[PDB]
């Protein structure tokens, strides 16, 4: 029951995140412009996409026992859960660090604060 509930909110979330990103794309003003806000807009866009890009298979493997149609060895779900559950998190800070000029400005501020420290 808890797994079904978490999937239900996951699919509703994925749908509403996709709808919101589509709405952002439909906004011509922010799209064609080179505003700095769009940097973190796209950033959270890629983050929100990769969240289920890495978690949807975990859901597939969790429902695999529920389908009980394929003989799944314990090791396969063990490995996929241990590798793909922490995966969507550990890479988000890297993506923001190395794919956002706003983070570069924040890092310049941090360097200034360290030097004045």
């Amino acid at each position: 029951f808890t797994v079904t509930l978490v999937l239900l909110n996951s699919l509703a979330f994925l749908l509403m995140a996709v709808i919101y990103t589509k709405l952002y794309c439909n906004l011509e003003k922010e799209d064609l412009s080179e505003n700095s806000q769009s940097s973190m807009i796209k950033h959270v866009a890629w983050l929100i996409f990769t969240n289920c890009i890495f978690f949807c298979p975990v859901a597939f493997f969790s429902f695999a026992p529920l389908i009980t149609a394929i003989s799944i060895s314990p090791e396969i779900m063990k490995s996929v859960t241990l590798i793909f559950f922490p995966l969507p998190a550990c890479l988000n800070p890297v993506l923001y660090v190395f794919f956002n000029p706003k983070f570069k400005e924040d890092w310049k501020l941090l360097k200034r604060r360290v030097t004045k420290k």
Partner: protein
């Protein structure tokens, strides 16, 4: 449909070669079997017997098979004397403690069973004097510490239901063991046949499968920590 049997209703039968009684609920004492010294087999189930006469092994010298299941047996008297006895089954009784000398000198014992009792304390040297015991059964009991001395000859063993048994056993004392059923699968990680199996859900020595996977999660953890802390620094 045997309801009640007279207390002294089987004595003096100096050649009664067997005796089986079942369903005698109204019986509340062990029968006064003195004189009947040629009972190869004996059975008494579904009766309200509380204890056993102590001279049992001194009277039925050539007793071979004995069974006292489904009774209210509480205290086990000394069994020294039934040197030809082979099987004992006392399951579904109120037996609560086991002393060292209860099984002293049961040379020919082969099958033993105490399942579904209240035994929790087994003396360390309980099985030291045992012979070629093959099946031992103490499933569904309150064991906490399991002695293993003088048990290497066992072939089959069960401990399922012993929740208080949170420990494991050394393979050095179970040389000839074949089948085992322990309450927790981790108790089977030390070793052939086992129940329940130690599946990939519950590994034995490495939580992360093989090497280079531990390295994978190591790298994941270090990069997540470092990048996250740098992000907090920059943001706040």
């Amino acid at each position: 449909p045997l309801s009640f049997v007279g207390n002294s209703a089987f004595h003096n039968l100096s050649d009664l070669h067997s005796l089986v009684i079942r369903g005698a609920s109204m019986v509340q004492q062990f029968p006064n079997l003195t004189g009947t010294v040629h009972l190869e087999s004996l059975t008494l189930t579904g009766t309200k017997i509380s204890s056993i006469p102590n001279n049992l092994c001194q009277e039925q010298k050539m007793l071979r098979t004995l069974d006292l299941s489904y009774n209210n047996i509480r205290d086990l008297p000394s069994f020294n004397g039934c040197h030809a006895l082979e099987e004992i089954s006392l399951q579904r009784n109120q037996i609560y403690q086991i002393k060292e000398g209860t099984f002293q000198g049961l040379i020919s014992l082969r099958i033993l069973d105490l399942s579904r009792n209240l035994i929790h304390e087994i003396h360390s040297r309980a099985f030291a004097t045992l012979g070629p015991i093959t099946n031992l059964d103490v499933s569904f009991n309150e064991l906490t510490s399991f002695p293993t001395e003088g048990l290497n000859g066992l072939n089959q063993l069960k401990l399922v239901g012993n929740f208080k048994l949170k420990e494991a056993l050394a393979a050095k004392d179970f040389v000839n063991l074949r089948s085992l059923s322990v309450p927790y699968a981790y108790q089977c990680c030390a070793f052939i046949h086992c129940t329940p199996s130690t599946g990939a859900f519950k590994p034995c020595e490495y939580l992360l499968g093989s090497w280079m996977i531990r390295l994978t999660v190591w790298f994941i953890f270090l990069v997540a920590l470092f990048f996250n802390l740098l992000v907090i620094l920059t943001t706040f």
